[PDB]
Design a binder for this molecule. Structure first.
Ligand SMILES: Nc1nc2[nH]cnc2c(=O)[nH]1
Ligand SMILES: Nc1nc2[nH]cnc2c(=O)[nH]1
Ligand SMILES: Nc1nc2[nH]cnc2c(=O)[nH]1
Ligand SMILES: Nc1nc2[nH]cnc2c(=O)[nH]1
Lengths: 295, 295, 295, 295
């Protein structure tokens, strides 16, 4: 036997960083969860019990803190590039670094119609993430994403015209609730190294804001023919707004809300046009994906 | 042996209800999770296998749907009173109903600086809850609450002057991060029955908004001497704003963010006044509670 | 306003302890999660920002480690009594200690039909817990419990004869799946202090083993008329086996497995006596409780 | 823009199946969670709102129930092959089916030293899984796995000789606790179709039992030089025992248990050779992976 692939590192490293404007007295906090996995010439640690090739996972954790201390942690696409680049340049036998970052929301509180200087609130569980792969001699691959964005529209969603055969019991509908947890990923064109990533810095936050806005507007306005059709429209718009993106990927659960027939109880009418009370279903759920790129 | 206490019912009943304004075309959704437990003369179901006294848990579930269909589901203190009252009046041998409701947020989306008629987003995992106990001949006891409100302030929090003995290693501090998940409960004065609850309807939503606002403002503005001191101030204000409240209860975790000493690495300064990078701690955590009432 | 009730302390303190037999070379591990909340004369910490009365939560955490170091951590009813007693004797103004302990399973591995000296496996998520309230001048109240015991029987469970009215749609049945997560608590008679608890040490583990065994045997053998009837039988037996127990409490979810009618598909028969494939339901679920004591 | 990749289907389909031996009266239950995602000529559902190409996710759910009704659900590698094969043969425009199955444990209860005919208990949260990809014209790819196997050894684990530089603070050790959650996957050689999978049926369960046993024995007996070294030894043995396996993959977290220095308290000795009380750390954790194949 032989080692076909190997990676190791530190997972679930929680990091918080505060920025203090001495001028204005305004404070800004950043909180994230970091994973860093390394690859290189480390086979002997597995095959020969040779630990000399191992950069201890505890040292990797130390390095994340130090890096966060000496560099900006935002935007995450930059911080992740700096962190991955560090491992491949510092260690001769390490040739790839895979860095995953999850940014948690800490939103400035508004007190009395005015932004508070140092108080924050977590508004929802929606995350902004980055996956950065830094490979010696192959540049920097970045995939940015937003996830945990949960939305629902109570009408203007349809589903009819689908295949019908002896396995089908689902009825066609012209009016239904559509609810989902949005997971959207945009993959950037490969970057030659850190200097190139630094040159595109302003595009990261703007592209994140754009993906979010397009996602929300398209969901709210589209008279949805299906989840498939609505998601393609979002992805089409994101690609058209940012040329440096190669592919957009969406992964959407269809969280079902079933009508409850109450007619067995005093002829109570609660179906079709009279539907008011529904039962949200925990499982199972439809799962719909699509990767859209440039023709 | 004998049955000293008994209750049974249906838990985790998810309910969704939509309101459609035919005039404006505006839709409003309500989503909640309901638990209903009953008590009464049901001992024989346990002792003698006598199921004749049992209102099937499946029937209790049916009843929640029917009740939601025929009545307003908001404010939750009213819907819960209606639901509990129903069981004790309908069934002769049922003398207490305990109804718990958790309201999930579905917040109208703003598209292009304007409220969307039928699209919603879950902004955070913060809940509004109610506990309603409807006891035959003893009226209606209601406890309302908000939970899952997660906040953090990066400065203006202190902790010094505490007891020091041979078990103490904690250092006094004049500047620290304060973060917590707020769980606040206000207990209403006992109500004689449904007609009395209906008479106070407008006070429910207003008191909920008040508890939230006071909680947020006090946390942000108080130069906190301790979690204990800050929570008492919140509770004091809520009691002063609403006379129909008998007691306010707060339960607050103190989620710790530790300084990271980086001086072993090139004399890097990251403690005290130079602290920028912290390590959020998952556990353990301080847990601080207090019940405040009227003197 | 005034402080009606107050308690504070440390939650989620994870503790591991290893015992090494120098003779046999056999090692035994104990892992638990501890919560300790204190009460006493601490009102001024809330009302006057007077921290002098506060035993820091960090010190409480230190104390748990020290106590675990100097005393046996098993059985948990003893360790919890020692820990609570410590706070009320050490601090003059602290009059009650509430200690909660959750024991996690680490079960000796069997390698080659033989017990391994120092390797363990977590077999299931079932917990053994204790709640200990140590109140100055009122002795020691202990509630022991087992939870997270998940079981299912595929037949020999019935449910018929229940009340039927206009809210009922559930059909009577003579054969069904019964599945639940067992939560059983036995409350001990009040103890005068530590010396009395020490005198009953051997009864703790034996009573825990007994509750478990009776729970499992009764569930498997009873031709269940209802969850209510089966749980009363368990509680009756536990009370008869241990006189020092005052009350047994059971709290049982009824996790439903619905039949799937497949007759719309080629007359496939999958209901009643032909039922083979079921759909486990995540929610909602029946919740059945009962507290049984001595007549 | 264009669709580069697309898949859709049903996730979280919970299925239970009971087998009743009319002879012996012995019942056997199987419980699983199934995901099925399809690919084929379905681009137009995204691009043109053409639902005619869509096999409704609800129909996919129906099909899982029907398939489970007409076929054995064990071993899971077979059931998954049958299910995936069904979609590609039945639908002309569907060319790949991806089926994921998670098997939950329901272990026959032993009552009075004897196997009970129809009562079961969930012993741990350990899963047996399968991933089956059925691609038209490319046969059947199966990856089997076990996950959620949580183990700990209190001694006979070392970690010394690792790289040391200015980022290192970790001390070398010759004696430590080693704890992890085992995730092991074995990939089978490609199968030509269902008839070939049926021919190897007996090898599935045996290979699963083998992977488990080797994993447990190697963990318990190896005087571990590192997680890397111990995992390679397991994978080496699995490959040697089953020729039809092409690659073994392990993914192991290193769950840390830190020593607690108690010397600041009365010179209490709790480090190195005197270590008895440890603090289990929730995060961060080391993450170590390796894919081992044939030379
Ligand atoms: N939008 C949408 N709804 C569905 N309901 C059942 N299947 C589907 C599907 O593929 N798409
Ligand atoms: N606010 C606050 N911080 C603490 N840190 C340690 N103990 C305490 C406590 O009781 N209150
Ligand atoms: N055992 C049992 N099954 C039920 N199914 C519906 N209600 C009940 C109940 O109260 N007990
Ligand atoms: N086994 C093991 N322990 C570690 N502790 C820190 N890093 C490592 C590592 O790579 N392997």
């Amino acid at each position: 036997s032989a080692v076909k692939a190997a990676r190791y590192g530190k997972d679930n490293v929680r990091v918080y960083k505060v920025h203090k404007d001495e001028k204005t007295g305004v404070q800004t906090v950043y909180e994230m969860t970091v994973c860093v996995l390394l690859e290189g010439e480390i086979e002997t640690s597995y095959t020969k019990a040779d630990n000399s090739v191992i950069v201890a996972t505890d040292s990797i954790k130390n390095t994340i803190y130090i890096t966060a201390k000496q560099n900006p942690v935002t935007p995450p696409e930059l911080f992740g590039s700096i962190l991955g680049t560090h491992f491949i340049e510092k260690y001769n036998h390490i040739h790839a670094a895979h860095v995953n970052i999850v940014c948690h929301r800490w939103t400035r509180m508004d007190i009395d119609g005015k932004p508070h200087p140092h108080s924050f609130i977590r508004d929802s569980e929606e995350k902004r993430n980055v996956q950065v792969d830094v490979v010696e001699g192959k540049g920097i691959d970045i995939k940015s994403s937003l996830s945990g964005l949960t939305v629902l529209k109570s009408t203007n969603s349809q589903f009819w015209g689908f295949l019908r055969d002896e396995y089908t019991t689902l009825k066609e509908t012209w009016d239904r609730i559509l609810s989902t947890d949005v997971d959207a990923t945009w993959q950037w064109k490969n970057f030659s190294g850190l200097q190139e990533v630094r040159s595109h810095v302003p595009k990261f936050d703007a592209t994140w804001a754009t993906a979010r806005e397009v996602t929300l507007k398209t969901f709210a306005e589209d008279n949805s023919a299906s989840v498939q059709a609505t998601m393609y429209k979002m992805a089409e718009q994101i690609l058209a707004r940012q040329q440096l993106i190669e592919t957009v990927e969406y992964s959407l659960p269809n969280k079902h809300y079933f009508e409850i027939d109450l007619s067995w109880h005093k002829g109570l009418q609660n179906t079709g046009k009279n539907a008011e009370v529904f039962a949200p279903q925990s499982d199972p759920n439809g799962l719909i994906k699509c990767t859209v790129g440039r023709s």
